[PDB]
Design a binder for this molecule. Structure first.
Ligand code: HEM
Ligand code: HEM
Ligand code: HEM
Ligand code: HEM
Lengths: 146, 142, 146, 142
């Protein structure tokens, strides 16, 4: 569907209590560790030798923070998601050539990291609104290549 | 394909997690029906199919009983879950895609509950394990 | 991307030399046989007992013909694909609840059946134009549920 | 998971198909680069990466040599293709998704060429086989 008031509320609430600094580094790290083919694209980052090299890599941390900051822009623009991500889309699909399945992998990691930070507050309803948000943005990072 | 440390890993976690298996099953199955409502038709014959629901609670208990069963049979997932595969992949004709779903929901419920035990390292082996479950359950399709 | 003159030509050419009667029955049959979970949704069809029961089932044949006839409408409307499939979309995603992965499975079967009918005429370039067409229509059968 | 009739099936087909393995490899690899151009970066170090290309032709020969290798090792795909897995899944860090792609292209090239031998029945077992290949090749990721 298209946005409900209830969803707008929840999504803005999640993003306003979120610690980018904590969540970003953790979601990316985990993605690189659970789906290690992903590291092919983060070559310039350096020491990715094993799980602890990744967790403490500052290049990875700072870049995790930027994925989050990129989520934030669609939060601010819920009715114009596909044009806000056009530029991103183009970079990920034609400059970089990232299989679109990967966007879904990164997303699952953000949910997983958010679920552990929120504990029981991360309700089925809150999970639903959030997955909708990420679904819609994963469509926009891909969208143009098919 | 589970290594010796993958098995060890799944086991040490199930050892910590296990106490709450019923809570995990109920919670995981409610998230599935609520966030991926395409999955509600498999349980459409139950009266109440909402997160409260006694139906949801009993069967969450059963699913997690299937995960315990698989921890036990981790050396041969294929023959250990052959009965479950017969029913899901052959009788129920459950779309394979739903297993990725349910699996994701389980991982989310565990992050919820045991945030500290659910490390990235544990995450990798539980994921190879849930994928091996799914593959084992896919045995009777074709 | 969006349509090239070259692609418009190819796609219209493929559909104008196509035998719906031959291809349709065959693509569906094969889909039901190679990805047998698919049969869950074709319950009213009847005897689906094994591969030869499916190949000769007339319910399946006639329905294969209708998937093709549904492709034909997007052929006629290349610039308005998402609104032409709205109705279809709704039936497949909210009345029926077909995982979207399945649309991609049916597609691969149509390509495979078309490749064998066309032989060497089914060039890499012709394969490319056709997969673009099906990609775009698979986006429209799903599109609204996410 | 390949049954005895799945193995028989793959073998009877490879027995018919086999003569043209090089033609199949070249053709399959050209379709891949042309219809799924996201895959061209893995071969970006080659001068000419177009359907003609001598590069494409030599390596199509090699890939199909890997399929022959797997027909031989069909009782244990996992240990039979461990070297290939090391290189693809571990050194090249090839995205797993590309294997579904290449596999699809191979099936299309075979329909092209042996329309009559490529039955639905053959189709099922070749598909379980290419999936087992992919899984075997995925061994060294994590
Ligand atoms: C999942 C949703 C994603 C979002 C919202 C996102 C967002 C972003 C943003 C905002 C940037 C920085 C743009 C700039 O500074 O110019 C970026 C860069 C990048 N992203 Fe993503 N990304 C996502 C998924 C992925 C995935 C799954 C991959 C897998 C490899 C990936 C690979 C890359 C790479 C390689 C770069 C550039 C790194 C560099 O060259 O420094 N992204 N992404
Ligand atoms: C993911 C791992 C899964 C495990 C371990 C699992 C385990 C089980 C178990 C132990 C039963 C037992 C009830 C009996 O013995 O009749 C069962 C039944 C059932 N399963 Fe699952 N299952 C899984 C996934 C799925 C998925 C993803 C779906 C649907 C989307 C599903 C649909 C069903 C249905 C409809 C039943 C029958 C319940 C009834 O008739 O009341 N299963 N499953
Ligand atoms: C792949 C692209 C597809 C196209 C273009 C397509 C098109 C169509 C069309 C045109 C109809 C008939 C509409 C009517 O007469 O009112 C239909 C019905 C149906 N389709 Fe599809 N379809 C596709 C994929 C799928 C897939 C993958 C499934 C998997 C189960 C599926 C399941 C169904 C079912 C169950 C029906 C209704 C059968 C009945 O109730 O008689 N479709 N589809
Ligand atoms: C699908 C089954 C596949 C098989 C049987 C296979 C087989 C092979 C073989 C035998 C080699 C040998 C060359 C050597 O020994 O160095 C090779 C190399 C290679 N493979 Fe594959 N492969 C498969 C899929 C893929 C995919 C899908 C991709 C990329 C999208 C890929 C990328 C590569 C690359 C980049 C090389 C190195 C060639 C070079 O450096 O010049 N492979 N593969």
């Amino acid at each position: 569907v298209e946005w409900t008031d209830k969803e707008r509320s929840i999504i803005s609430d999640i993003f306003s209590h979120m610690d980018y600094d904590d969540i970003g580094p953790k979601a990316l790290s985990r993605c690189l560790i659970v789906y290690p083919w992903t590291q092919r694209h983060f070559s310039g980052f350096g020491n990715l030798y094993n799980a602890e090299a990744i967790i403490g890599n500052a290049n990875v941390a700072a870049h995790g923070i930027k994925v989050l900051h990129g989520l934030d822009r669609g939060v601010k623009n819920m009715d114009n998601i596909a044009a806000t991500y056009a530029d991103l889309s183009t970079l990920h699909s034609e400059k970089l050539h990232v299989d679109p399945d990967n966007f879904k992998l990164l997303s699952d990691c953000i949910t997983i990291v958010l679920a552990a930070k929120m504990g029981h507050a991360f309700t089925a309803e809150t999970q639903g609104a959030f997955q909708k948000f990420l679904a819609v943005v994963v469509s926009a990072l891909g969208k143009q290549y098919h | 394909s589970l290594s010796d440390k993958d098995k060890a890993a799944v086991r040490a976690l199930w050892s910590k997690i296990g106490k709450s298996a019923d809570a995990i099953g109920n919670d995981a199955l409610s998230r599935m029906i609520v966030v991926y409502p395409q999955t509600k038709t498999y349980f459409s014959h139950w009266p109440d199919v909402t997160p409260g629901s006694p139906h949801i609670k009993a069967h969450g208990k059963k699913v997690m009983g299937g995960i315990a069963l698989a921890v036990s049979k981790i050396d041969d997932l294929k023959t250990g879950l052959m009965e479950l595969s017969e029913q899901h992949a052959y009788k129920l004709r459950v779309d394979p895609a739903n297993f990725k779903i349910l699996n994701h929901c389980i991982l989310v419920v565990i992050s919820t509950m045991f945030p500290k035990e659910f490390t990235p390292e544990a995450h990798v082996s539980l994921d190879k394990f849930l994928s091996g479950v799914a593959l084992a359950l896919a045995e009777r399709y074709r």
